[PDB]
């Protein structure tokens, strides 16, 4: 086509989606990770995670307001990944890299899994 | 912070949101523009438009499944802008620039209004 493109548009949209998350506006699901609860937008979760994409395209699960993750999932690892989904920034540290990678594998977040594997290979 | 960032994340999220729109997945509102209807995600509309942000943060309107736009709004101008919201690409042409600018002013999409004004000033 003969379209023009606004370079910063995708980043501006994500920034605004994160502002809605921070003010709890139009969040439509709670993700339960053991004793912790995380409110989010189903669409953003599906856009970032192969697991949430499969969950919310299911004709029964698409209507659930609460999703319980596997008990092996670490709430901090999930929190770091939820922040990444809404910001593109990943808080990857020596103390959390194993939990973050395990959570990204479960959530099916291929690019996060890839950088975790590379950072782990560099430290061995 | 000491975060790393995935450059393509925001663009990949928006691409996936557009795929959900194309398959009509988790769309939660209909925008009526005269005889035409457009299905969309409330969060994406709010993230792109000052008008939709004001509409869906209103305690009564946040719950509406149908929003009727002003009758002066052109359905093609709206369609072009809805496509821009989900893709960052604007199909701006000599034949549609006036309708697109008028629609972007009503929707409160400042960057679109700015490029329309510049393209119009160049042709005079």
């Amino acid at each position: 086509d003969s379209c023009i493109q606004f370079t910063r548009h995708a980043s501006d949209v994500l920034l605004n989606l994160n502002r809605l998350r921070s003010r709890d506006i139009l969040t439509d699901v709670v993700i339960v990770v053991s004793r912790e609860q995380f409110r989010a937008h189903k669409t953003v979760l599906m856009a970032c995670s192969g697991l949430f994409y499969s969950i919310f395209t299911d004709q029964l699960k698409c209507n659930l307001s609460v999703i319980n993750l596997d008990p092996e999932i670490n709430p901090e690892g999930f929190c770091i990944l939820l922040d990444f989904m809404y910001t593109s920034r990943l808080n990857l540290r020596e103390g959390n890299i194993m939990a973050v990678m395990a959570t990204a594998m479960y959530l099916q977040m291929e690019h996060v899994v890839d950088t975790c594997r590379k950072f782990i290979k560099a430290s061995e | 912070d000491s975060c790393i960032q995935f450059t393509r994340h925001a663009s990949d999220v928006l691409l996936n949101l557009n795929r959900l729109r194309s398959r009509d997945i988790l769309t939660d509102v209909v925008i009526v523009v005269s005889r035409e209807q457009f299905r969309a995600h409330k969060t994406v509309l709010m993230a792109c438009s000052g008008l939709f942000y004001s509409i869906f943060t209103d305690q009564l309107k946040c719950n509406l499944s149908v929003i009727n736009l002003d009758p002066e709004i052109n359905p093609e101008g709206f369609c072009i802008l809805l496509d821009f919201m989900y893709t960052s690409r604007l199909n701006l042409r000599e034949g549609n620039i006036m309708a697109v600018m008028a629609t972007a002013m009503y929707l409160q999409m400042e960057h679109v209004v700015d490029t329309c004004r510049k393209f119009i000033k160049a042709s005079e």
Partner: peptide, 4 residues
Amino acid sequence: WVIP
């Protein structure tokens, strides 16, 4: 704005 750019030519994509």
